[PDB]
Amino acid sequence: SFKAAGTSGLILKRCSEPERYCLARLMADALRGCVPAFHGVVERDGESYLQLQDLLDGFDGPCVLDCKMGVRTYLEEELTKARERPKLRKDMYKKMLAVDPEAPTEEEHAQRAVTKPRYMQWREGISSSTTLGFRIEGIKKADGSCSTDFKTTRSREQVLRVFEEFVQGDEEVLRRYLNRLQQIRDTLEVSEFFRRHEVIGSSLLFVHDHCHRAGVWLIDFGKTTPLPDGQILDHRRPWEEGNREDGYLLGLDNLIGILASLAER
Numbered sequence: 001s002f003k004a005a006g007t008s009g010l011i012l013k014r015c016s017e018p019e020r021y022c023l024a025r026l027m028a029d030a031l032r033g034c035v036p037a038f039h040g041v042v043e044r045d046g047e048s049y050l051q052l053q054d055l056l057d058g059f060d061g062p063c064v065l066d067c068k069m070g071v072r073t074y075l076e077e078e079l080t081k082a083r084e085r086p087k088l089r090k091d092m093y094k095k096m097l098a099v100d101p102e103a104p105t106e107e108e109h110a111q112r113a114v115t116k117p118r119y120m121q122w123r124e125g126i127s128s129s130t131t132l133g134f135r136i137e138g139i140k141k142a143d144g145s146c147s148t149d150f151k152t153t154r155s156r157e158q159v160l161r162v163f164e165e166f167v168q169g170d171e172e173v174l175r176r177y178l179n180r181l182q183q184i185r186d187t188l189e190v191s192e193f194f195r196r197h198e199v200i201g202s203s204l205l206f207v208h209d210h211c212h213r214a215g216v217w218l219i220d221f222g223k224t225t226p227l228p229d230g231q232i233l234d235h236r237r238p239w240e241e242g243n244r245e246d247g248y249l250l251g252l253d254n255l256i257g258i259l260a261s262l263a264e265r
């Protein structure tokens with residue numbers, strides 16, 4: 001999905017129409033500073049790429065944690081599609097049997113395949129997504145080491161322990177992360193973009209280094225979609241099919257609470 005840009009400090013991501021639309025709006029929004037700078041689109045090898053700020057550029061050997069935000073992680077239109085015209089996914093079946101052999105139904109076992117929405121719902125439930133409104137997806141280091149081994153990280157305390165290990169006792173990093181999340185929450189709550197879009201499948205990317213530099217940005221607007229006609233979301237109330245609620249701010253509230261708790265340990 002990513003390639004190296006010519007210009008210093010930039011990075012290319014394969015263009016997608018929803019994401020291009022979102023980033024454009026966001027540069028003119030209150031949230032402008034809370035997302036990677038978007039510099040337009042460019043062609044390479046006959047294909048479109050977003051020109052983005054490389055969020056790692058200011059850092060010396062950055063540690064990175066990606067947190068998928070929301071209680072729901074698929075669009076409502078996927079549910080519609082899975083009813084009328086299910087696309088059976090065999091890979092998604094095998095993961096289930098790995099985490100939980102009793103998870104698939106008798107019929108799923110017989111099909112060796114599940115619908116995407118079914119797969120995404122189960123993933124939300126064995127992780128923290130359903131209960132806390134976010135989940136940890138991965139950690140990268142310049143230590144070189146990366147991990148995506150977080151599929152059953154669910155309890156508030158399991159999540160805390162992952163962040164505890166990620167910050168490695170750096171009080172300044174943690175204080176900065178918290179300060180940045182508070183300011184992001186404040187921006188989200190007045191953002192014109194945020195009240196009028198359903199924000200699904202995006203992440204908060206935490207970045208720090210051994211010099212105590214810390215930043216956090218919202219990324220990945222590929223599944224972020226406008227609400228029709230001045231309908232708005234509050235981003236905290238439970239999702240019920242039809243209301244298009246994403247629980248984004250429930251997740252952000254909970255994440256801030258966990259980091260604040262960690263800070264007081």
Ligand SMILES: Nc1ncnc2c1ncn2[C@@H]1O[C@H](COP(=O)(O)OP(=O)(O)NP(=O)(O)O)[C@@H](O)[C@H]1O
Nearest residue numbers: 001011036052053054055056064066203205219220
């Ligand atoms: N602007 C950016 N600068 C530097 N690193 C970035 C940037 N945007 C994204 N990344 C990173 O690349 C990873 C992938 O980003 P993402 O925008 O979610 O791409 P994706 O391929 O569309 N989606 P997914 O399948 O969920 O990873 C993140 O967890 C970061 O490590």
Ligand SMILES: O=P(O)(O)O[C@@H]1[C@H](O)[C@H](O)[C@@H](OP(=O)(O)O)[C@H](OP(=O)(O)O)[C@H]1O
Nearest residue numbers: 073074075092116120123200201202222223
């Ligand atoms: O992380 P996992 O468990 O591997 O599951 C993937 C993850 O939810 C991606 O974010 C998602 O892409 P979107 O967010 O764009 O839907 C992708 O869907 P896909 O396979 O249908 O592209 C899944 O396979």
Ligand SMILES: [Mn+2]
Nearest residue numbers: 201202203220
């Ligand atoms: Mn992503």
